[PDB]
Design a binder for these strands. Structure first.
Lengths: 519, 754
DNA sequence: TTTTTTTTTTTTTTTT
DNA sequence: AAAAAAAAAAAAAAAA
């Protein structure tokens, strides 16, 4: 029918549930494993595909935004650029994933330059966030048009969720995770690997609390403990302020050395001015901002008839020098939202690294076995080069040459006999049928091996290349042995994971910025 | 010779997969129509002129031919006998079969030359159940339809048990079809429209005759295959009929005298029509062939109807007068059915009438003959304004997402977006004191948002505005919802518009099964298209269930459980049987393992139920876990679906099984490989165009899809229960978040569950 | 160069 | 105390 009646209840329910599930799964919340939203994941994938390496030259932000919008992200420009701007600026992320050139804003409230002015490049840590992507370590999902494919999750080496934090709003849910120090988070991961039945008290010993990019003070610790036990808690972030007293005269000045997280300095100065004008806060004679690009310095001159400590306490209570940070650790786990505590996040990351390393070893073992098969073909061919060239000359076309090569079993030379029998088993690919290969001192080439022998060039008949093939075969046998050793023992998998985590801690180690105090 | 017996046994093992449902007697008639279809395919080449079908008293069906004279056949495998006599090359030859096994040298001589092959096949009582004899009515109906469609082809029928007879021979063809359809009814004019013009290889035949029943009955065929759901030929037929009749009324001025504009479903009222088409390579929406989706057929039918129906109307003034009188009477009845109303000033070049600048208003001053399209933005507004009907359709583009009036205060409704909406509708909704819905300027308010997630959200916000602020407008049925497509998909000449991702999945399955033949054995006939389609549909349903079960159990184990034998409750009592079953399962899992997982089994002896349940250990990524298949899982319903699909897929692929897609061929070892190959071959020339809103659609594409009343697909918003609607709106759209979270989580769990 | 909405926690105003 | 209203963080829809 042209017109078919629909109830308002069913239409509203279907439309709003589609929107809510779409926002919750896709855009709002992050994934617990790689700690990235789909827009972040697609931006990083587009930059990696373009080749925005940290040591390569910069590229214009417009090119990256157009590449993301055209191929991967169907949701319009000027939000992708906002994501890139937030990822490129150090006062937002504890470890920036984008290396930007130009104006990307400031804590004073200046907006970033337009898309046409700035230039964009990957940070060095973002490469370790995408390590071994080409070794089929993660599942690739299709594009919106089906023309390309995007990773479902990144094979991260950094715990990006705990490290950089997150903040987003879904329809039903809303996530708010603070950033942490990478060294302490890696130490917590190593402690978990050492003892998987580790308590949250031990994880708190290794991870005392969050570490915001803006160095500050965290008043309490009950909020941190509640957040790391239940996944929710309230933290109070204080400003670094000192009532510096003049030696010559009794007048005093309050100098705010550092500011809380996600607090705009311009709005703070404006609000202090508003309170002074309305006389809600007394004792303030003057107000200035003397940030000389050497930190920040907000000078507040106290009057003679004012203690100064009381003025600073009143500024803490009323102004935005104290901010309540409500922790709400909601993230996607197995493609559904879930409130997760510290140990759940660490366990999820370690499971992700287990999966990534196992898939990487499977891919490398398959590649090594295939190359060993091809090298066996080349060695047997160069052992019997004279009858092979005679057969190829006698045949009329390459297809008949391939059929003749496959039909004739080939004698193993002395070099090939010593090479192949030293390898023994554990070098044939799994898919290879038992008919082919060495059988009673006579090789049986496949169609692929005959094709490879036909593709052999005359350069390989030189004396050096046969020794090169022998050495490469020995190296591949050793690599296959090491890969089988990793895939066999469950402890060697954790040895590899621990070595990778220790190397990541060594390369990107950093010191604490925020202080946890007792009050 | 040995290969033939393998094919006959393959057909006879699963006769329902090939011929159809044998229980209700459809298979016997399908066999008869297979033989008759072979005869008619012979007849289409201008050789045969007589097909004497018979129904002997011995429960046997002869299909005689007088034509020209002519693997493993499906028809002779099921039937317990054949009597093949071919009177070719001046000598009569004879062959005898028995369950497909010939017993002769297949070469005999006889007197008289003649032509044609007569085949008396005897259906086997073993394969078919509950229907032994043949219903004369079904064969008579289908043979008469074939006689109508294949004009100038005698089709005798002689029921020898009763002595009945028939002789279907109609040289008129489609005109005879219309006469047969209208013989019981009362046609309103004597002549019958008819043409049989062919163009570009698409032979088209159409006929028409109106009657007094005010019922629509349009039948359509494609290569003598009926289409229940119409298709492109039906759409082109309707478009051409409406265009020609509207142009005729405009030219002669009948409409001005009546002061009423006829539309679709008035011309089609009281209509009998047949639309026979002959495409060389037709394309259907499914293997049932209930809908033709061939893009080339609409244009041919449209052009030929547009020429020849107008030509017929010019040369038949009396019948045109009678049909136009009927259409005028129907239009007058429709006009009388409407609610009272008054004319409204419309925005125009001379007079703007104090309406918004963004309103692209229409020319019709009468509400109930005008429409308003509420679109999402200015680019969508431009795309909709470029393609529309200026007489009827007005456009009022919004600006992104609008206020949530549920959360917002009444005084917060001072936004430019909502004031612009209120001015155009002119219900005076602001204040709830001047709100008079009788002064509504359009009696059709169409929420034509984009076809994506945020379009759905904006649709919900608009529905909140219309339900909360203008509740009587929703009650009276003025609010409509358009359904623009999200995807356009093209394979060379073929083109289709797809609304949802579920429709995209169905379309992908349809291409995968398009022209695909699956052979269980190397020497055996292909499966029926409908049987393979049902197999693939059930397979995808079980795969979706297994994906839902991915957290509880590994996907590999559940996928392997399809091919293993079933484990009933009685099996759980025996220690040995469960051990053998789980050992076979784990060995099969270990053999086909492409990753590092290592599968092991154990059996836990329950002292309460006195059973021996199995456990499936797995060591994946170095993590060891156990998955006991408890008593709940064995009778859980999920395992019932897995077992039913397993019973269907135990032995559908022997060692030498293969599939084909015309020229291309592929041997297969599992149904997964066949499905993957079919999908991969389907997506070769494919190209999907996703529309990120109406600004990416051309105005012609937007007009063809969801602005034309002929091809429109709308929905009227209605309120079944006021209380339930109020509760749902308050929960989903109110200030409190906890009921919204509970609703979302409950629906997520419901989706995860059954 | 500039502006309007959706969405959820959390705080601050302000008004009673 | 109470209750409502406003603003702000980040991904999305829209334009001027």
């Amino acid at each position: 029918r042209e017109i078919t009646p629909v109830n308002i209840e069913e239409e509203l329910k279907s439309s709003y549930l589609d929107y809510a599930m779409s926002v919750i799964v896709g855009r709002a919340l992050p994934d617990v494993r790689d700690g990235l939203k789909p827009v972040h994941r697609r931006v990083l994938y587009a930059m990696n595909v373009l080749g925005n390496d940290w040591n390569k030259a910069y590229k214009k932000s417009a090119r990256v935004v157009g590449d993301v919008i055209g191929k991967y992200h169907p949701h319009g420009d000027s939000a992708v650029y906002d994501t890139i701007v937030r990822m490129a600026q150090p006062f937002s992320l504890r470890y920036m994933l984008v290396d930007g050139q130009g104006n990307f804003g400031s804590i004073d409230g200046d907006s970033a330059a337009a898309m046409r002015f700035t230039e964009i490049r990957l940070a060095k840590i973002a490469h370790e966030l995408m390590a071994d992507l080409e070794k089929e370590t993660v599942d690739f999902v299709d594009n919106y048009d089906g023309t390309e494919k995007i990773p479902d999750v990144m094979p991260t080496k950094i715990p990006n969720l705990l490290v950089n934090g997150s903040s987003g709003i879904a329809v039903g849910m809303a996530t708010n995770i603070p950033p942490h120090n990478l060294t302490e988070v890696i130490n917590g991961c190593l402690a978990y690997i050492d003892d998987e039945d580790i308590s949250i008290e031990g994880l708190m010993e290794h991870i005392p609390g969050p570490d915001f990019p803006t160095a500050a003070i965290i008043n309490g610790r009950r909020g941190i403990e509640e957040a790391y036990r239940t996944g929710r808690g309230k933290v109070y972030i204080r400003a670094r302020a000192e009532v510096e007293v003049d030696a010559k005269t009794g007048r005093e000045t309050i100098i705010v050395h550092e500011i809380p997280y996600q607090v705009n300095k311009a709005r703070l100065i404006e609000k202090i001015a508003e309170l002074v004008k309305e006389k809600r806060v007394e004792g303030i004679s003057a107000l200035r901002d003397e940030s000389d690009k050497d930190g920040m310095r907000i000078v507040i001159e106290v009057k003679r008839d004012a203690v100064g400590e009381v003025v600073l306490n009143n500024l803490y209570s009323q102004t935005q020098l104290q901010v309540s940070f409500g922790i709400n650790m909601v993230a996607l786990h197995h493609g559904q939202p879930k409130i997760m505590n510290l140990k759940d996040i660490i366990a999820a990351f370690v499971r992700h690294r287990r999966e990534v390393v196992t898939r990487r070893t499977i891919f490398e073992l398959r590649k090594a076995r295939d190359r060993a098969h091809i090298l066996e073909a080349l060695a047997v061919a160069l052992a019997n080069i004279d009858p092979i060239i005679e057969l190829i000359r006698h045949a009329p076309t390459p297809a008949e040459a391939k059929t003749a090569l496959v039909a004739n079993p080939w004698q193993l030379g002395n070099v090939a006999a010593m090479l192949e029998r030293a390898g023994d088993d554990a070098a044939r690919p799994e898919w290879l049928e038992p008919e082919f290969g060495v059988r009673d001192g006579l090789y049986y080439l496949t169609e692929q091996q005959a094709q490879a022998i036909l593709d052999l060039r005359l350069q390989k008949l030189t004396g050096l290349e046969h020794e090169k093939l022998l050495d490469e075969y020995k190296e591949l046998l050793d690599q296959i042995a090491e890969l089988l050793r990793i895939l066999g023992s469950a402890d060697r998998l954790m040895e590899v994971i621990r070595e990778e985590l220790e190397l990541v801690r060594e390369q990107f180690g950093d010191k604490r910025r925020t202080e946890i105090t007792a009050n | 010779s040995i290969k033939v017996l393998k094919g006959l046994d393959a057909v006879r093992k699963r006769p329902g997969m090939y011929i159809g449902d044998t229980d209700d007697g459809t298979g016997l008639h399908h066999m008869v129509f297979e033989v008759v279809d072979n005869a008619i395919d012979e007849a289409l080449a201008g050789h045969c002129k007589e097909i004497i079908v018979t129904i002997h008293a011995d429960n046997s069906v002869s299909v005689q031919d007088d034509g020209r004279g002519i693997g493993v056949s499906v028809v002779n495998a099921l039937s317990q006998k054949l009597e093949l006599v071919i009177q070719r090359e001046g000598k009569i030859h004879r062959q005898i079969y028995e369950h497909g096994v010939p017993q002769a040298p297949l070469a005999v001589t006889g007197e008289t030359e003649k032509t044609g092959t007569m085949v008396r096949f005897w259906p086997s009582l073993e394969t078919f159940t509950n229907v032994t004899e043949f219903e004369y009515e079904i064969l008579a109906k289908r043979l008469r339809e074939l006689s109508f469609l294949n004009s100038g082809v005698s089709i005798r029928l002689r029921d020898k048990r009763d002595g009945k007879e028939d002789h279907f021979h109609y040289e008129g063809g489609i005109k005879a079809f219309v006469e047969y359809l209208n013989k019981n009814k009362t046609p309103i004019h004597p002549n019958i429209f008819y043409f049989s013009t062919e163009k570009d290889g698409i032979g088209v035949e159409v006929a028409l005759q109106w009657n007094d029943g005010f019922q629509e009955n349009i039948y359509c065929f494609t290569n003598n295959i009926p289409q229940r759901d119409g298709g492109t030929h039906l759409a082109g037929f309707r478009a051409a009929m409406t265009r020609t009749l509207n142009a005729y009324m405009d030219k002669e001025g009948y409409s001005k005298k009546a002061k009423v504009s006829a539309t679709g479903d008035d011309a089609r009222e009281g209509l009998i029509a047949v639309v026979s088409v002959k495409v060389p390579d037709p394309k259907f929406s499914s293997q049932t062939k209930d809908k033709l989706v061939s893009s080339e057929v609409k244009s041919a039918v449209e052009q030929q109807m547009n020429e020849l129906l107008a030509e017929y109307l010019l040369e038949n003034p009396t019948d045109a007068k009678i049909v136009v009188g009927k259409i005028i009477d129907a239009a007058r009845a429709r006009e009388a059915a409407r609610r009272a109303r008054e004319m409204t000033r419309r925005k125009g070049a001379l007079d703007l009438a104090g309406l918004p600048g963004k309103l692209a208003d229409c020319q019709e001053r009468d509400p109930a003959l005008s429409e308003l399209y509420l679109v999402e933005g200015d680019s969508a507004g431009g795309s909709a304004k470029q393609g529309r009907n200026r007489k009827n359709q007005a456009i009022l583009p919004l600006k992104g997402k609008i206020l949530n009036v549920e959360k917002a205060r009444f005084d917060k409704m001072l936004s430019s977006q909502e004031v612009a909406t209120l001015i155009t509708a002119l219900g005076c909704g602001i204040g709830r004191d001047e709100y008079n819905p009788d002064k509504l300027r359009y009696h059709s308010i169409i929420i034509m948002t984009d076809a994506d997630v945020d379009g759905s959200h904006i649709r919900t916000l608009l529905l909140t505005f219309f339900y909360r602020q203008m509740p009587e407008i929703v009650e009276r049925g003025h609010v409509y919802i358009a359904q623009p497509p999200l995807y356009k998909v093209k394979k060379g000449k073929q083109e289709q518009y797809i609304k949802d991702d579920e429709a995209m999945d169905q379309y992908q399955i349809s291409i995968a099964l398009d022209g695909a033949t699956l052979h269980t054995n190397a020497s055996a006939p292909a499966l029926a298209g409908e049987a393979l389609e049902k197999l693939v549909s059930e397979y995808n349903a079980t795969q979706k269930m297994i994906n839902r079960m991915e957290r509880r159990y590994p996907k590999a184990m559940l996928k392997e459980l399809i091919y293993q034998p079933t484990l009933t409750e009685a099996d759980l009592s025996d220690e040995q049987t469960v051990t053998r079953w789980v050992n076979a399962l784990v060995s099969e899992l270990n053999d086909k393992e492409q990753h590092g997982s290592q599968w092991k089994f154990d059996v836990h002896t329950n002292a309460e139920q006195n059973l021996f349940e199995p456990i499936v250990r797995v060591r994946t990524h170095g993590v060891d876990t156990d998955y006991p298949l408890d008593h709940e899982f064995i009778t859980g319903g999920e395992y019932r679906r897995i077992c039913t699909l397993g019973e269907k897929l135990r032995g559908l692929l022997e060692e030498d099984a293969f599939i084909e897609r015309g020229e291309r061929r592929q041997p297969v070892a599992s149904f997964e490989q066949a499905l993957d190959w079919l999908v991969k071959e389907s997506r070769r020339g494919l190209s999907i165009q996703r529309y990120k809103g109406l600004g990416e659609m051309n105005p012609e594409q937007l007009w063809e899809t969801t602005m034309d009343p002929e091809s429109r697909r709308m929905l009227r918003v209605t309120v079944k229960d006021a209380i339930a609607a109020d509760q749902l709106f308050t929960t989903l759209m109110g200030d409190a978040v906890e009921p919204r979270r509970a609703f979302i989580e409950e629906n997520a769990l419901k989706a995860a569950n059954i």
